Amino acid sequence: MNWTVDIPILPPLPTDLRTRLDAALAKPAAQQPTWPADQALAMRTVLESVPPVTVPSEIVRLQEQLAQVAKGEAFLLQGGDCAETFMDNTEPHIRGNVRALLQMAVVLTYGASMPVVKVARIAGQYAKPRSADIDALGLRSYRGDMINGFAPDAAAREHDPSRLVRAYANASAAMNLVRALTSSGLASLHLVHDWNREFVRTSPAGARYEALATEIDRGLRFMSACGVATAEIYASHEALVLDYERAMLRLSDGDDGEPQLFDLSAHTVWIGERTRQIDGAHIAFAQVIANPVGVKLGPNMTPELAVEYVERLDPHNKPGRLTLVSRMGNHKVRDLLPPIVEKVQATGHQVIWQCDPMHGNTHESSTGFKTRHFDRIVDEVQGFFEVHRALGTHPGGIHVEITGENVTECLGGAQDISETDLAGRYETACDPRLNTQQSLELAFLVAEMLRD
Amino acid sequence: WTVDIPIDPPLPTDLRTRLDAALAKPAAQQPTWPADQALAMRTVLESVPPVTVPSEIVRLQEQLAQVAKGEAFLLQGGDCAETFMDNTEPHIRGNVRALLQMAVVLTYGASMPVVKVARIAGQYAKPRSADIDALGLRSYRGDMINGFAPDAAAREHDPSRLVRAYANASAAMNLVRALTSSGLASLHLVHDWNREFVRTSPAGARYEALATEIDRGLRFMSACGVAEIYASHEALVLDYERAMLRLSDGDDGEPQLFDLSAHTVWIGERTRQIDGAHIAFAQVIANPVGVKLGPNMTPELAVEYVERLDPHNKPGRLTLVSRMGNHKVRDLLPPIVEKVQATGHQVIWQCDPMHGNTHESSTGFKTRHFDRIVDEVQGFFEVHRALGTHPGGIHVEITGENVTECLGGAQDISETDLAGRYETACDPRLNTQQSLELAFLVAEMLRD
Numbered sequence: 042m043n044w045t046v047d048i049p050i051l052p053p054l055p056t057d058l059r060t061r062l063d064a065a066l067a068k069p070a071a072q073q074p075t076w077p078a079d080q081a082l083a084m085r086t087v088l089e090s091v092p093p094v095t096v097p098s099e100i101v102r103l104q105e106q107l108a109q110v111a112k113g114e115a116f117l118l119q120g121g122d123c124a125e126t127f128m129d130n131t132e133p134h135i136r137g138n139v140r141a142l143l144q145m146a147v148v149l150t151y152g153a154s155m156p157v158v159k160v161a162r163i164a165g166q167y168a169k170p171r172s173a174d175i176d177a178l179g180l181r182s183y184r185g186d187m188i189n190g191f192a193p194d195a196a197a198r199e200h201d202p203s204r205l206v207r208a209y210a211n212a213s214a215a216m217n218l219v220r221a222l223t224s225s226g227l228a229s230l231h232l233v234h235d236w237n238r239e240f241v242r243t244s245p246a247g248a249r250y251e252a253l254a255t256e257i258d259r260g261l262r263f264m265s266a267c268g269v270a271t272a273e274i275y276a277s278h279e280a281l282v283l284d285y286e287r288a289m290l291r292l293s294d295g296d297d298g299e300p301q302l303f304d305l306s307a308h309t310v311w312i313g314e315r316t317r318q319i320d321g322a323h324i325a326f327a328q329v330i331a332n333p334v335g336v337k338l339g340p341n342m343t344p345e346l347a348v349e350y351v352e353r354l355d356p357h358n359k360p361g362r363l364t365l366v367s368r369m370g371n372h373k374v375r376d377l378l379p380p381i382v383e384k385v386q387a388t389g390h391q392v393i394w395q396c397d398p399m400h401g402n403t404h405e406s407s408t409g410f411k412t413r414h415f416d417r418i419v420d421e422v423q424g425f426f427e428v429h430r431a432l433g434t435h436p437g438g439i440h441v442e443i444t445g446e447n448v449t450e451c452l453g454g455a456q457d458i459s460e461t462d463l464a465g466r467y468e469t470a471c472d473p474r475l476n477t478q479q480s481l482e483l484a485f486l487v488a489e490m491l492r493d
Numbered sequence: 494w495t496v497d498i499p500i501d502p503p504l505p506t507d508l509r510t511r512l513d514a515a516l517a518k519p520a521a522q523q524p525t526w527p528a529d530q531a532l533a534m535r536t537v538l539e540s541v542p543p544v545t546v547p548s549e550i551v552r553l554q555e556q557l558a559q560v561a562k563g564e565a566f567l568l569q570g571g572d573c574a575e576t577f578m579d580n581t582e583p584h585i586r587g588n589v590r591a592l593l594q595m596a597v598v599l600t601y602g603a604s605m606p607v608v609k610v611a612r613i614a615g616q617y618a619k620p621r622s623a624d625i626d627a628l629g630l631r632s633y634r635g636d637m638i639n640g641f642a643p644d645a646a647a648r649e650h651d652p653s654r655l656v657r658a659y660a661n662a663s664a665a666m667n668l669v670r671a672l673t674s675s676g677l678a679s680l681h682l683v684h685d686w687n688r689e690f691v692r693t694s695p696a697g698a699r700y701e702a703l704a705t706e707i708d709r710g711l712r713f714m715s716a717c718g719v720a721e722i723y724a725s726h727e728a729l730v731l732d733y734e735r736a737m738l739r740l741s742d743g744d745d746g747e748p749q750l751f752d753l754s755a756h757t758v759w760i761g762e763r764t765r766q767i768d769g770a771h772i773a774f775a776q777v778i779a780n781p782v783g784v785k786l787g788p789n790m791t792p793e794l795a796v797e798y799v800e801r802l803d804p805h806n807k808p809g810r811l812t813l814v815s816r817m818g819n820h821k822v823r824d825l826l827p828p829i830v831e832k833v834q835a836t837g838h839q840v841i842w843q844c845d846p847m848h849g850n851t852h853e854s855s856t857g858f859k860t861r862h863f864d865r866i867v868d869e870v871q872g873f874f875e876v877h878r879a880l881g882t883h884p885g886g887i888h889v890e891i892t893g894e895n896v897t898e899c900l901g902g903a904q905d906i907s908e909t910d911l912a913g914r915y916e917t918a919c920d921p922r923l924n925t926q927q928s929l930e931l932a933f934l935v936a937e938m939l940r941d
């Protein structure tokens with residue numbers, strides 16, 4: 042049961058982009074998939090002619106909005122599934138993740154009293170890194186459906202290069218739908234916030250959030266009363282699989298009218314903690330592409346390394362071109378983040394300081410499932426805000442993993458999801474996502490932090 | 494040469510009973526693949542993100558209702574036969590562009606809004622009059638069914654092309670959306686290409702006036718202080734259109750069935766049996782639908798389409814597409830217009846000046862004579878002016894490439910030129926210049 046694509050039988054790069062790109066891919070790359078270099082090459086030839094998932098004008102537009110975030114004048118909300126599955130690439134799932142992001146954005150916008158840039162982990166998040174190459178059941182590790190199968194069989198965990206095309210096909214389908222949803226009635230702010238006032242009515246913790254959901258309702262009605270009457274959701278994934286990102290590269294006149302290389306698998310991509318080798322091919326790939334890029338910074342980050350990233354990835358001091366995504370865990374952020382900020386801020390580069398309160402607070406549960414505690418996530422964002430407020434720098438955004446489904450993958454929250462509940466609805470293919478109820482809860486709380 | 498791509502919430506029972514009964518009618522021109530495999534691929538397509546959403550169809554239904562009511566013009570165009578291997582960024586990009594160029598021109602001459610409908614994101618299947626072609630092979634019936642390659646294997650009907658077709662359709666509709674919401678939207682840009690057309694083109698002097706007159710309205714627009722492209726294909730492979738059915742509510746309040754593989758679909762000359770499955774399928778879906786009408790159309794039968802496909806007198810919901818041939822449109826059409834108008838139904842009279850003017854070229858290729866296309870639209874207008882009806886739109890076959898599939902126009906493509914760039918996998922298309930030329934000419938027909 043399978044379909045079949047023909048292998049073809051694009052214009053040459055200017056010599057410098059040819060060289061820098063070939064130079065960049067020559068360098069070592071962690072966590073890449075093992076599969077025949079000639080099969081991967083067949084895939085990349087398919088992917089080199091397909092209609093792009095994004096287009097350059099949209100990436101330039103995001104670069105401009107992200108510059109406003111960098112400069113303290115807007116706020117970045119990045120969210121979505123931890124790992125996208127070809128299995129769940131369905132309208133109800135996409136719609137509920139779009140809805141979830143749009144809801145959090147209204148709340149965050151009112152809290153920040155400034156615009157929120159919405160970026161979804163969607164339309165390409167089909168690949169993850171693995172600390173160990175053999176998993177709990179002695180099997181080859183699952184690396185995301187761009188690589189192998191979540192199914193726990195020896196045959197499913199084989200790295201299949203055809204999943205490159207299967208990943209693009211799913212990606213541009215989900216993107217088509219995202220485009221359609223965000224230009225439909227789903228985007229209307231008044232519609233989107235009624236979903237939030239529903240949440241307050243039906244939630245156990247409605248009381249904690251009702252005053253604010255009502256303040257927002259009055260802000261929206263205030264708009265209408267003044268004579269006002271859409272949405273932009275950008276695509277992002279971790280750029281982990283260089284074969285994929287290579288194929289999706291397209292050449293176009295850029296911010297300066299000279300030809301640049303845009304990675305059109307998404308609008309923005311981030312290198313993760315296990316792949317940010319400073320002299321590696323990931324970081325060097327990031328130096329050839331025009332896209333906004335981000336870098337995960339965990340607890341072993343030094344102010345001086347952080348600065349080297351800033352000087353390599355933001356060579357031209359383009360505010361908002363580089364995002365630095367902090368994930369230290371709550372007990373470490375207040376101590377570790379300030380020195381990094383002070384030294385980076387001192388260079389004169391305007392980075393976006395994005396908080397990631399998820400990948401620093403995971404812990405195996407007493408049930409066998411890997412989970413995260415709501416109260417620890419809150420604490421790190423809070424701690425992240427405390428540190429930026431102390432320094433006078435901009436808390437530029439968050440980076441959360443969520444679904445529009447009432448899964449039970451994270452503890453606590455309004456539902457006091459306990460360790461014996463994490464088995465009732467553990468849908469995720471990788472890390473524990475906050476269900477929709479905990480998504481909005483956090484958005485409300487982060488909105489409170491944004492206020493004064 | 495190829496690679497295998499692996500694979501791995503029902504509708505209400507009262508709508509399936511209705512639907513299963515409608516689809517029990519006889520369907521022409523259908524694939525001959527095993528129903529169990531078809532059923533597997535359908536179950537796949539039953540769960541994928543839709544190519545369109547109901548709010549866009551309800552929205553199109555609103556815009557088309559104004560075409561019927563006389564206050565807007567329908568521009569429908571694109572490739573004759575989409576192929577998976579030409580479904581590329583440049584090709585999509587130049588068909589979007591060409592279609593935007595024609596719409597600016599037509600909007601000015603019509604002095605009213607122009608709905609833009611592309612043949613794209615699903616136009617992967619054609620009927621065939623003979624199931625053995627001139628190579629003595631099973632005929633090519635579109636990439637949704639089999640392969641353009643001459644050989645027994647390629648020509649076998651492959652139901653996994655249902656999925657490959659949807660994939661190509663999504664990827665292309667995702668790009669059209671990106672394109673229409675970026676710089677390509679901008680009129681002053683789209684028309685600056687129209688003025689490259691006039692600079693380069695040989696007939697430049699024939700169109701320099703109107704091109705300048707428009708550039709001045711655009712500057713006037715700007716001085717005074719001051720895009721949607723819909724998708725459509727012929728609904729042919731019914732395993733596809735029915736797997737792409739989704740349930741939501743529209744202009745009613747009750748939940749309707751939409752076919753979310755496109756925004757509007759039409760039923761071809763060879764599938765419109767009043768009691769066949771295709772007409773019965775259009776009955777059931779909420780999408781705007783069109784029906785092709787050739788020379789052997791009784792004024793009586795046009796009316797039975799109107800009663801069967803516009804049962805609730807919704808203007809624009811039904812379009813009737815003239816495809817008579819220039820030599821026949823002026824005489825064969827008027828009685829059809831009359832008989833339908835007198836029924837109290839508002840429909841879109843749309844002109845297809847191509848699918849009935851295809852003449853074999855002395856050099857082997859099937860082609861079309863520019864002067865005969867232009868002349869059928871012209872005669873199509875002369876009818877409607879004479880009858881006081883609304884010339885509702887054109888349905889046209891174009892590409893953004895400089896192919897040489899049609900005869901005449903600016904470049905004066907001749908019997909021997911057809912071999913230069915005959916790139917269509919089916920009918921011959923007006924190249925970029927001829928699409929624009931025709932656009933200017935139809936603007937003058939619309940002129941006050």
Ligand SMILES: N[C@@H](Cc1ccc(O)cc1)C(=O)O
Pocket residue numbers: 051052053054089287288289290291292
């Ligand atoms: N896709 C090519 C690079 C490339 C990109 C765009 C081009 O126009 C040309 C070449 C690679 O992976 O090496």
Ligand SMILES: N[C@@H](Cc1ccccc1)C(=O)O
Pocket residue numbers: 045046047087091092210577578579580657660661664
């Ligand atoms: N059009 C090519 C490549 C493609 C694959 C998947 C989706 C879109 C395009 C094919 O069908 O083989």
Ligand SMILES: N[C@@H](Cc1ccccc1)C(=O)O
Pocket residue numbers: 127128130207210211214499500501537541656660
């Ligand atoms: N998600 C399914 C269906 C699908 C096919 C092709 C494109 C998009 C979705 C798959 O991976 O096959």
Ligand SMILES: [Cl-]
Pocket residue numbers: 096097098099675
């Ligand atoms: Cl662009």
Ligand SMILES: [Cl-]
Pocket residue numbers: 520521522523
């Ligand atoms: Cl038949």
Ligand SMILES: [Cl-]
Pocket residue numbers: 577636639640641
């Ligand atoms: Cl084919």
Ligand SMILES: [Mn+2]
Pocket residue numbers: 123124442471472
């Ligand atoms: Mn994760």
Ligand SMILES: [Mn+2]
Pocket residue numbers: 573848890919920
């Ligand atoms: Mn045709």
